[PDB]
Amino acid sequence: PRGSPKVISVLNGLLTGELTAADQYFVHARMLENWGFKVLYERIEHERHDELDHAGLLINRILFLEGVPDVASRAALNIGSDVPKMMANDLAYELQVVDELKAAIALCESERDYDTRRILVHLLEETEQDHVRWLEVQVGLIDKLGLKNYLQSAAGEI
Amino acid sequence: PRGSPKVISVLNGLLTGELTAADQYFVHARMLENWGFKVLYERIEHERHDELDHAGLLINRILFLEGVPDVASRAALNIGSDVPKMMANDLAYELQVVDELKAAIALCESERDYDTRRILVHLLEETEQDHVRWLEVQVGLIDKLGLKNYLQSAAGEI
Amino acid sequence: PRGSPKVISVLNGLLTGELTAADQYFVHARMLENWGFKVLYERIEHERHDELDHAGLLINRILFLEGVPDVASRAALNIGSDVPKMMANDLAYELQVVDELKAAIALCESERDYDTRRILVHLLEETEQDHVRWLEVQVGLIDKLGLKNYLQSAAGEI
Amino acid sequence: XXXXXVXXXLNXXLXXXLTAXXQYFXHARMXXNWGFXXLXXXXXXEXXXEXXXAXXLIXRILXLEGXPXXXXXXXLXIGXXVPXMXXNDXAXEXXXXXXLXXXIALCEXXXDYXXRXXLXXXLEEXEXXXXXXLXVXXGXXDXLXXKNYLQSXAXXX
Amino acid sequence: XXVXXXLNXXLXXXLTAXXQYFXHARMXXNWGFXXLXXXXXXEXXXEXXXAXXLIXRILXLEGXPXXXXXXXLXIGXXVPXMXXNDXAXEXXXXXXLXXXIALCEXXXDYXXRXXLXXXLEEXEXXXXXXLXVXXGXXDXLXXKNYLQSXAXXX
Amino acid sequence: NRTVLAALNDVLRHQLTAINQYFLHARMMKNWGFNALGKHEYKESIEEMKAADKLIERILLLEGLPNLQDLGKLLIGENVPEMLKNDFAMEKDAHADLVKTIALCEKQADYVSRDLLSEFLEECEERMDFYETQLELVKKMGEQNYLQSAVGAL
Amino acid sequence: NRTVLAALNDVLRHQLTAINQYFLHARMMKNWGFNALGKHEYKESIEEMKAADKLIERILLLEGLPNLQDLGKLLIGENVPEMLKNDFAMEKDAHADLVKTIALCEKQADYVSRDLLSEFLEECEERMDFYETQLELVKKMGEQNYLQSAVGAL
Numbered sequence A, B, C: 001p002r003g004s005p006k007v008i009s010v011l012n013g014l015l016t017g018e019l020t021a022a023d024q025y026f027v028h029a030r031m032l033e034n035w036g037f038k039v040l041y042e043r044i045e046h047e048r049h050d051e052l053d054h055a056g057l058l059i060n061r062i063l064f065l066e067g068v069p070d071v072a073s074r075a076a077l078n079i080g081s082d083v084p085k086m087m088a089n090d091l092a093y094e095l096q097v098v099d100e101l102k103a104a105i106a107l108c109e110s111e112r113d114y115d116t117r118r119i120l121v122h123l124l125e126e127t128e129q130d131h132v133r134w135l136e137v138q139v140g141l142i143d144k145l146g147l148k149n150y151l152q153s154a155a156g157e158i
Numbered sequence D: 001x002x003x004x005x006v007x008x009x010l011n012x013x014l015x016x017x018l019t020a021x022x023q024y025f026x027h028a029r030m031x032x033n034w035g036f037x038x039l040x041x042x043x044x045x046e047x048x049x050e051x052x053x054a055x056x057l058i059x060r061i062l063x064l065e066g067x068p069x070x071x072x073x074x075x076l077x078i079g080x081x082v083p084x085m086x087x088n089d090x091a092x093e094x095x096x097x098x099x100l101x102x103x104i105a106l107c108e109x110x111x112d113y114x115x116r117x118x119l120x121x122x123l124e125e126x127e128x129x130x131x132x133x134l135x136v137x138x139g140x141x142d143x144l145x146x147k148n149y150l151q152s153x154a155x156x157x
Numbered sequence E: 001x002x003v004x005x006x007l008n009x010x011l012x013x014x015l016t017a018x019x020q021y022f023x024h025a026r027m028x029x030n031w032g033f034x035x036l037x038x039x040x041x042x043e044x045x046x047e048x049x050x051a052x053x054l055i056x057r058i059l060x061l062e063g064x065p066x067x068x069x070x071x072x073l074x075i076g077x078x079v080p081x082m083x084x085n086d087x088a089x090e091x092x093x094x095x096x097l098x099x100x101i102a103l104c105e106x107x108x109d110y111x112x113r114x115x116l117x118x119x120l121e122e123x124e125x126x127x128x129x130x131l132x133v134x135x136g137x138x139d140x141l142x143x144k145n146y147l148q149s150x151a152x153x154x
Numbered sequence F, G: 001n002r003t004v005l006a007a008l009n010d011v012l013r014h015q016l017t018a019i020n021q022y023f024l025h026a027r028m029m030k031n032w033g034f035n036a037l038g039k040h041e042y043k044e045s046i047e048e049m050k051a052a053d054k055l056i057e058r059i060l061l062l063e064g065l066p067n068l069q070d071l072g073k074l075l076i077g078e079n080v081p082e083m084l085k086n087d088f089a090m091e092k093d094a095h096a097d098l099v100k101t102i103a104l105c106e107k108q109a110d111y112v113s114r115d116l117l118s119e120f121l122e123e124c125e126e127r128m129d130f131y132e133t134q135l136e137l138v139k140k141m142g143e144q145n146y147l148q149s150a151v152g153a154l
Ligand code: HEM
Pocket: F016, F019, F020, F023, F046, F049, F050, F052, F053, F056, G016, G019, G020, G023, G046, G049, G050, G052, G053
């Protein structure tokens, strides 16, 4: 079942974004583990696995629509120097992912391509809840608890 | 735990190779499952997970050596149009990875950095005896059973 | 819970489509069992039961909307004489059903019948993933494995 | 004390078994290398069985106050392909069976009956668990076709 | 090619070791020394496993395992004799293994190097060690006491 | 080889000094109520003690007599971060000597000793990373927060 | 009290020397194949280890500094009977110093220290009785029989 060329194009853009986010979460989780912030490490590891599953779902949808996934192309990685910086970078990338996902969902709706709209809506719900909500909560917790208290909560049991 | 700069650069090259291998394995597994080759899809997906673990080990070693990893840079993806081309591309990439790993192991031995040499020997063992030999077996089986019988075995149950 | 007459009409058309699909899948399952293709017969019987569940949901939705289900009508059955012909006929009918479902989803979104839109989107998801994808994969496997190997796979254990 | 002739025949049978075991091992690992996991597992089982047989033979030779010759080994007819391996295995096993029949006759003649019981057990094992399977495999390689037989031998991928 | 030749040499060594260990074990079991027999049978099994690993490694290197070429079996007549012969064979094998590991390192083949290092660990710290121990014990305990310990339950 | 056994004995002396320092530090950590860090120090002492056991096995297998008499200068910290720094310094020196000994074992072709020392080096490097991470955590979380974490269960 | 702390440090030094001597002796016994005796001395070293740990905790609670750096002379014997003799002699010296320290703790009204040292003395005299019994058994059964008993399994 051939899909719209525009639908495949925006799906490929979504896949590029998801793979870039997966790689950024990979780097951030590994630097968190290196620093000793174990709780943040596990959370970002689960977030990276979620991004990998999202990318897999996008690839399956693209292959179903007889497209060719653009898995070679990647976006610029924003790697933060310290924990607040990586949290802010993750939140910024998640918000950009939200914007592009809304645009892609609108395009899929205009193209009468409703199964892909369902997958993209599920991806948008996962991104808003598991990623944007958690990261904005983390930023607020850094603001409230303070830097040292948040880092202590992130380090877990030493 | 300061690492050598040549060792860090060779580790970054190996990590880029492993990330590109993971991407190629992801695409190949997804197209194999799209075509209905379930057995091959499961095997290549396990291989992709193993390559993700390899990249994790390499990133952790790079970070422990106080060097920044390289995850934005990605090598060229060779994607086949059918199962034998998939096997040929994966086998060629794995052989190239093995050659680079042996060069890196020689460098690590030369620089008296033995923990990275241990990690790289583990990675070489895994690549040769779980990736290279399996792909060689697959190409031999395509030659022996023929194309149609091998595809029948790859499809598994329908 | 009065629904638009157009919505009830398109629901009746979809119900006719799913009932005809159930009849065709029933005949095809029996013919596959007669020919000895136990694997294909089991899959086609599962598809027929799923389509019966689909028709059940459609009838419940029509009755809830205070509309009369049109369960008497049945479209033409396309019966093949061999496994490839039955696969092609099933794929063609499921693609037709996909067209009808997309038109009905567009209408329901136009008519603000959002719960009907949700059940129809679930129907379209089931049809595109469980049915259309499997039949397309089977056609590809007939092309790749050959006819004899595909029939050997469909026979199963003897 | 066992007879000189009986101990000699038993050492011969032992050499046969040892060569068979080595050949079976080489073939099983070759098949594993090629990816034919099912046939590899079967041949490994056969090699283990041959090892057990050789051990029984060694024990028997030792009980008769004779010295086992576990240094001598016959030529290893190794096949380059699966049907070749099967044919080679069948040939070797047939030779071993002939030798065993002769040995059983000698043991019966020399009034050695426990040795003959051991030899008869080994003969049933070599004609049933081995020669029969190999003959069947050759027949199936001819009936199924080499391609289908190899696909069956690969088992799962 | 040198690596393949070295691996084949080590394979011949391991096959000979297995063939000698088995004979010694069955002689020791024939004599009634059940404990020593069990130990040597386990040793033979381990040697068979190691030789199999060697065969698999040679095959993965596109080679032909010489599973027909075997070396001289030094069989003993008394338990001390078998112990000493086994120790000698194992020492020679360890020397050969060290040479082979050095060659594998020089030839940049690290997988076979790792396999050979594992084999060397199994040889030195599990076979040569045990036999050296037993050789010392047959002297510290006396021949009679050691044979009684070897006979297990009589 | 005399030099290989001498280097093994130096590694053993470093390991025994590490054992004593780790156990002493764990004991004064429990004395201060720093339970989490005290338990981690206790397990590190246990790991170093098992490693010294393995090295004593290796030295005795090489027909060499272990030197358990000598002990390097102990680095005892007045407070938890000072103990972290002293642990890191001791592990740095032990790791440098370990790397030198691994290289020497490669020169003399004592590959089993080299493998054991490589395993010990893996342990030493993970310990070094842990202590560097702990010191960075002291810097980032602050002394009060880090000590509260080190307390664990009150 | 300073005198109690000094006596506790001396007893701890004997504890550490005993730990090292017992571990070395057990490792040599295992190297010679004496599994039963070697395992017994390994358990004995672990008991000594726990006793030293308790002594360090006690010394820390008294606001003293446990001197884990210093060690005594190690009496390492070349054979099993001489190793038993050296262990017995070390235990005798430790018991005499322990009795003196218990008397000092009673004089200085340090009663929990006295209770801990009394537990140590009970265990030490249990070890002394065991080693004297082992020496008597060496004499009675003979060295060959005793070494066979020490070997255990094969
Ligand atoms: C010198 C002061 C030492 C102290 C205070 C000490 C303390 C301890 C303690 C408390 C244990 C736990 C006992 C148990 O859980 O059963 C232990 C076990 C052990 N120690 Fe010692 N030890 C010392 C020296 C040594 C040395 C020098 C070695 C080796 C060269 C060593 C090797 C071991 C081993 C192998 C164990 C057993 C570990 C286990 O059961 O998992 N120790 N030690």
